[PDB]
Amino acid sequence: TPQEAQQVDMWKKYIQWEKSNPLRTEDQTLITKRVMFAYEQCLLVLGHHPDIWYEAAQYLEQSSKLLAEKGDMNNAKLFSDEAANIYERAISTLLKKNMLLYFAYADYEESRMKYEKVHSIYNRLLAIEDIDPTLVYIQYMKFARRAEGIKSGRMIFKKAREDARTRHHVYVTAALMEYYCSKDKSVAFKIFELGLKKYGDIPEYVLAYIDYLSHLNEDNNTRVLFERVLTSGSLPPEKSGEIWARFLAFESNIGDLASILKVEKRRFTAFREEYEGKETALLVDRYKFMDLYPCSASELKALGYKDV
Amino acid sequence: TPQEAQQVDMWKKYIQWEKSNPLRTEDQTLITKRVMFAYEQCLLVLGHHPDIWYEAAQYLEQSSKLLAEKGDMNNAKLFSDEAANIYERAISTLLKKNMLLYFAYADYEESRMKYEKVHSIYNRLLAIEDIDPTLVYIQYMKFARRAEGIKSGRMIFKKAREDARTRHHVYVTAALMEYYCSKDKSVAFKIFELGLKKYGDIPEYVLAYIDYLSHLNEDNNTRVLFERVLTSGSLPPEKSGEIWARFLAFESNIGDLASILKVEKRRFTAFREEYEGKETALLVDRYKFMDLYPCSASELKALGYKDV
């Protein structure tokens, strides 16, 4: 609502004034106390805004940093700990399923080295039945690996495959992790293959896999994967649109005109209904390269051309 | 214009009807003529619709294949050379500078081994002063590679650079060609570097480079590239949005929380204006993964979140 936008601004503009140390004081612990009081007053009527909680926690974070740099250690801990309580209150009441704050809180405790504290935050979220954990497992994995090594990440991945709610993105994340961090193509291939087993009918997963393999730059292996995913019967034709496109493109970069036309023919087959009476529309994707088109916009729509 | 569209559809149907050979005749060359006569009358008034020319040119090419597939060589060649003149007529009259047709023409003549003919078409087009040759050179190089070889491709790439109208896309194409075909990273690097001098300010080109390098999976090199791309003044700050997200994503994949936050701080520092009092919206990009967001679309809305 437009009216609420104004409340949020009066609060933020007011908190800003408070942050500009009106007292002209120098006792940082006193400024921070006045600023927090303001945030509190704000949270009483805007407790449903993730940003309010986040910025407040962010403030105690920067504050604690200042008192530390300026020697004061006692208040550096009090404010550091208070920040974490901000996150706790956030997810413990008004925003119980807010992934954004859970992740912020996780990162904050990770920065403070409280790894067990982190583990309990992610798992706390996961234990909430009505949410899509996919993105949660990903963050969790990135944390395990980052702070406890490969083996730790793998355990989180395993916990992810065993959760019925997890979706395909988790396999992509795991496979690439093995490839980028472990520098291990062998396992990358294994996890992708494993995910292809249950998500061979999801174009974004298949495309995700196709893409990883393409960049290895070994023409043959790449062609096999293309054939396998397109010709296994797992991926419906109505959804193979971009796979065909990618395949065409691939044959264009390192193949020959016979490979290209041949593939473009198999696609027309798959969409004998779709691109019917519009072969010219399909022809465009044979020439377009990142924002460059064989025809003008108006000319391009008069062909009935639509692009992914 | 609705009127225009109605007529095309109208004629396409007729032409199509004539293609069904409503009066069952085992005389193809006659079915063809009847269909071509239909096309001809259509091209007489709708010569400005590329699809009509191409589709007609295709039918002939197919009729030439059905006749040649039964022994009748005479008509096979007759209809083949006929298809070619349809392209020839299409670019010589109403669509003098239409890329899709020149490419389709070139491609057709190429499938018939008429390479000199091909070279002529690409050149007749490049010969036209007011057009964007970029995509024309890209296609020419592709042809030059498959038909005459890598040494030939590099030749078209030279002309492409020599031409003051060309845009960055040609460098990306050459660089990747050297990578995907020549399997030569050393040259891919030079071309990309060569190009980087002329287009360090074009986010599209830079992202293309980063992406190529990034997939080579050598951490420190990728990092160095990011630092150069984002650090030299060549890239207008307001157009760095995406590069910074790639950078943050990159660190998120293979680095620790510190480097992640370090890059996030630099991103913010380069956008104080942009995302101000909207720090939370940026935090979103720290977690998002290929279509999975930490918040609900509406929640993302309130944060003033836009996707770079």
The chain-level structural class of chain A is mainly alpha
Q: Class of chain A in CATH?
A: Mainly Alpha
User: Secondary-structure element sequence of chain A?
Assistant: HHHHHHHHHHHHHHHH
The total count of strands of chain A amounts to 0
CATH architecture of chain A: Alpha Horseshoe
**Which percent range describes the beta-strand content of chain A?**
under 5%
**Biggest interface found:** A-B, 66 and 64 residues
- CATH topology of chain A, what is it called? Serine Threonine Protein Phosphatase 5, Tetratricopeptide repeat
Secondary structure: helix percent of chain A: over 70%
Shape of chain A: elongated
In total, the number of domains of chain A comes to 1
PDB class: structural protein
Keywords: HAT domain, structural protein
Assembly: dimeric
Entry title: Crystal Structure of the HAT-C domain of murine CstF-77
